[PDB]
Design a protein around this motif. Structure first.
Motif, mmCIF file in Angstrom:
data_model
loop_
_atom_site.group_PDB
_atom_site.id
_atom_site.type_symbol
_atom_site.label_atom_id
_atom_site.label_comp_id
_atom_site.label_asym_id
_atom_site.label_seq_id
_atom_site.Cartn_x
_atom_site.Cartn_y
_atom_site.Cartn_z
ATOM 1 N N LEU A 87 0.852 -1.231 0.000
ATOM 2 C CA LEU A 87 0.000 0.000 0.000
ATOM 3 C C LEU A 87 0.877 1.267 0.000
ATOM 4 C CD1 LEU A 87 0.010 1.806 2.701
ATOM 5 C CD2 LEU A 87 -1.634 2.385 0.823
ATOM 6 N N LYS A 88 1.962 1.294 0.720
ATOM 7 C CA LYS A 88 2.808 2.529 0.715
ATOM 8 C C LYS A 88 3.432 2.734 -0.660
ATOM 9 C CE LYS A 88 4.448 5.971 3.140
ATOM 10 N NZ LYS A 88 5.413 6.608 2.203
ATOM 11 N N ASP A 89 3.872 1.695 -1.290
ATOM 12 C CA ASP A 89 4.487 1.861 -2.635
ATOM 13 C C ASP A 89 3.454 2.478 -3.589
ATOM 14 O OD1 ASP A 89 5.297 1.644 -5.207
ATOM 15 O OD2 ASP A 89 6.335 -0.222 -4.931
ATOM 16 N N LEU A 90 2.224 2.050 -3.485
ATOM 17 C CA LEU A 90 1.155 2.548 -4.398
ATOM 18 C C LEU A 90 0.834 4.040 -4.178
ATOM 19 C CD1 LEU A 90 1.205 -0.337 -4.693
ATOM 20 C CD2 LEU A 90 -1.279 -0.459 -4.482
ATOM 21 N N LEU A 91 0.476 4.431 -2.980
ATOM 22 C CA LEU A 91 0.094 5.861 -2.747
ATOM 23 C C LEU A 91 1.308 6.779 -2.688
ATOM 24 C CD1 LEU A 91 -2.908 6.564 -2.563
ATOM 25 C CD2 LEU A 91 -2.177 4.154 -2.377
ATOM 26 N N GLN A 92 2.353 6.350 -2.071
ATOM 27 C CA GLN A 92 3.553 7.215 -1.985
ATOM 28 C C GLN A 92 3.954 7.638 -3.395
ATOM 29 O OE1 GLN A 92 6.832 5.543 0.058
ATOM 30 N NE2 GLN A 92 8.282 7.053 -0.559
ATOM 31 N N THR A 93 3.637 6.828 -4.370
ATOM 32 C CA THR A 93 3.998 7.167 -5.780
ATOM 33 C C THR A 93 2.806 7.859 -6.449
ATOM 34 O OG1 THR A 93 5.688 5.495 -6.172
ATOM 35 C CG2 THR A 93 4.263 6.048 -8.034
ATOM 36 N N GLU A 94 1.621 7.371 -6.210
ATOM 37 C CA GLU A 94 0.414 7.991 -6.825
ATOM 38 C C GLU A 94 0.310 9.452 -6.375
ATOM 39 O OE1 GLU A 94 -1.983 5.594 -8.660
ATOM 40 O OE2 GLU A 94 -1.459 7.439 -9.640
ATOM 41 N N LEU A 95 0.642 9.722 -5.142
ATOM 42 C CA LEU A 95 0.568 11.120 -4.631
ATOM 43 C C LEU A 95 1.897 11.804 -4.967
ATOM 44 C CD1 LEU A 95 -0.683 9.851 -1.189
ATOM 45 C CD2 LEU A 95 -2.146 10.889 -2.917
ATOM 46 N N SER A 96 2.416 11.529 -6.129
ATOM 47 C CA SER A 96 3.722 12.129 -6.541
ATOM 48 C C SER A 96 3.750 13.628 -6.225
ATOM 49 C CB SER A 96 3.908 11.940 -8.042
ATOM 50 O OG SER A 96 5.191 12.418 -8.423
ATOM 51 N N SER A 97 2.672 14.319 -6.452
ATOM 52 C CA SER A 97 2.653 15.780 -6.146
ATOM 53 C C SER A 97 2.963 15.958 -4.666
ATOM 54 C CB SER A 97 1.276 16.364 -6.467
ATOM 55 O OG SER A 97 0.935 16.049 -7.812
ATOM 56 N N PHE A 98 2.843 14.913 -3.911
ATOM 57 C CA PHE A 98 3.157 15.012 -2.461
ATOM 58 C C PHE A 98 4.614 15.434 -2.334
ATOM 59 C CE2 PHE A 98 2.179 13.576 1.845
ATOM 60 C CZ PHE A 98 3.451 13.638 2.412
ATOM 61 N N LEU A 99 5.456 14.837 -3.125
ATOM 62 C CA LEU A 99 6.893 15.195 -3.102
ATOM 63 C C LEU A 99 7.021 16.650 -3.554
ATOM 64 C CD1 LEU A 99 6.572 12.185 -3.235
ATOM 65 C CD2 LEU A 99 8.822 12.082 -4.317
ATOM 66 N N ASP A 100 5.979 17.194 -4.129
ATOM 67 C CA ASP A 100 6.050 18.599 -4.604
ATOM 68 C C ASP A 100 6.417 19.515 -3.432
ATOM 69 O OD1 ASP A 100 5.860 21.050 -5.640
ATOM 70 O OD2 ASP A 100 4.047 20.691 -6.748
ATOM 71 N N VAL A 101 5.945 19.224 -2.242
ATOM 72 C CA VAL A 101 6.285 20.113 -1.094
ATOM 73 C C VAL A 101 5.939 19.448 0.258
ATOM 74 C CG1 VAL A 101 4.053 21.120 -1.650
ATOM 75 C CG2 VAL A 101 5.554 22.261 0.032
ATOM 76 N N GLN A 102 6.846 18.679 0.801
ATOM 77 C CA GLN A 102 6.607 18.040 2.111
ATOM 78 C C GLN A 102 6.580 19.135 3.169
ATOM 79 O OE1 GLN A 102 10.210 15.779 1.953
ATOM 80 N NE2 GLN A 102 11.108 16.859 3.624
ATOM 81 N N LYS A 103 5.691 19.009 4.092
ATOM 82 C CA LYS A 103 5.527 20.031 5.170
ATOM 83 C C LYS A 103 6.018 19.481 6.512
ATOM 84 C CE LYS A 103 2.621 23.233 4.295
ATOM 85 N NZ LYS A 103 2.918 24.687 4.168
ATOM 86 N N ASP A 104 5.208 18.701 7.185
ATOM 87 C CA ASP A 104 5.632 18.135 8.500
ATOM 88 C C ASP A 104 6.233 16.752 8.275
ATOM 89 O OD1 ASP A 104 4.868 20.328 9.819
ATOM 90 O OD2 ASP A 104 2.982 19.561 10.519
ATOM 91 N N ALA A 105 7.515 16.658 8.430
ATOM 92 C CA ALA A 105 8.208 15.363 8.231
ATOM 93 C C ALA A 105 7.948 14.473 9.433
ATOM 94 C CB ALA A 105 9.709 15.608 8.092
ATOM 95 N N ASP A 106 7.518 15.045 10.517
ATOM 96 C CA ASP A 106 7.241 14.237 11.733
ATOM 97 C C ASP A 106 5.985 13.390 11.516
ATOM 98 O OD1 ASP A 106 6.693 13.125 14.072
ATOM 99 O OD2 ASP A 106 6.857 14.906 15.273
ATOM 100 N N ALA A 107 4.979 13.936 10.883
ATOM 101 C CA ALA A 107 3.733 13.133 10.659
ATOM 102 C C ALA A 107 4.040 12.013 9.665
ATOM 103 C CB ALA A 107 2.623 14.029 10.108
ATOM 104 N N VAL A 108 4.641 12.361 8.566
ATOM 105 C CA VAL A 108 5.010 11.324 7.536
ATOM 106 C C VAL A 108 5.938 10.302 8.191
ATOM 107 C CG1 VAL A 108 7.192 11.539 6.151
ATOM 108 C CG2 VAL A 108 4.994 11.819 5.033
ATOM 109 N N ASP A 109 6.824 10.773 9.002
ATOM 110 C CA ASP A 109 7.815 9.882 9.677
ATOM 111 C C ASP A 109 7.123 8.836 10.551
ATOM 112 O OD1 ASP A 109 9.710 8.646 11.065
ATOM 113 O OD2 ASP A 109 10.389 10.348 12.198
ATOM 114 N N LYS A 110 6.097 9.215 11.247
ATOM 115 C CA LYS A 110 5.403 8.235 12.130
ATOM 116 C C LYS A 110 4.663 7.207 11.285
ATOM 117 C CE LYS A 110 3.073 10.054 15.339
ATOM 118 N NZ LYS A 110 2.379 10.937 16.318
ATOM 119 N N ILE A 111 4.056 7.647 10.228
ATOM 120 C CA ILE A 111 3.304 6.706 9.362
ATOM 121 C C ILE A 111 4.291 5.710 8.756
ATOM 122 C CG2 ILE A 111 2.378 6.664 6.997
ATOM 123 C CD1 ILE A 111 1.347 9.164 9.752
ATOM 124 N N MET A 112 5.435 6.175 8.359
ATOM 125 C CA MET A 112 6.446 5.270 7.767
ATOM 126 C C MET A 112 6.891 4.267 8.828
ATOM 127 S SD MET A 112 8.648 5.944 4.708
ATOM 128 C CE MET A 112 7.658 4.695 3.842
#
Lengths: 93, 93
Positions: B33-58
């Protein structure tokens, strides 16, 4: 542009429908946001499943219904309710 | 039928797109599931904001990427990532 990506953009536009008051774009105070979805998801009452999941979510809005909810709070809390009525048979027609 | 209610039905149909393997309708193992959305939300890489929230999910997908995710897990985890890139300016065009 992708099917899953398209869903993300649509959710933001509808949030404006209720939150478009222009004042707080947030999903409003927890007390109000619950009145809106708890009723909009009327088919939810069609068949509640886990009352424990719904029960915990109601705890945050009743302990401080004056709290606040935004996009991550509206999506995580509303999806959480889906646990309590995830019944796919919850069809209203 | 409502604007917010309509979004709920559309999300289930797209989940079938990736999970429609017919085997596990779930959103698959956390590692996939992470491989699918982490790539589908490519625009996400457009501008990461809180690395702490993404960090916990990872942390959940890396500690046991072999775990499992379903509709409430796909919606709560994917919305959670939105915290880390909730930037509305994350427009790819």
């Amino acid at each position: 542009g992708s099917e899953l990506e398209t869903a993300m953009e649509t959710l933001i536009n509808v949030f404006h429908a209720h939150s478009g008051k222009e004042g707080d774009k947030y999903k409003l105070s927890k007390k109000e946001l619950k009145d809106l979805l708890q009723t909009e998801l009327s088919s939810f009452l069609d068949v509640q499943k886990d009352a424990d999941a719904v029960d915990k979510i109601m705890k945050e809005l009743d302990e401080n219904g004056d709290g606040e909810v935004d996009f991550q709070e509206f999506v995580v809390l509303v999806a959480a309710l889906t646990v309590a009525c995830n019944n796919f048979f919850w069809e209203n027609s």
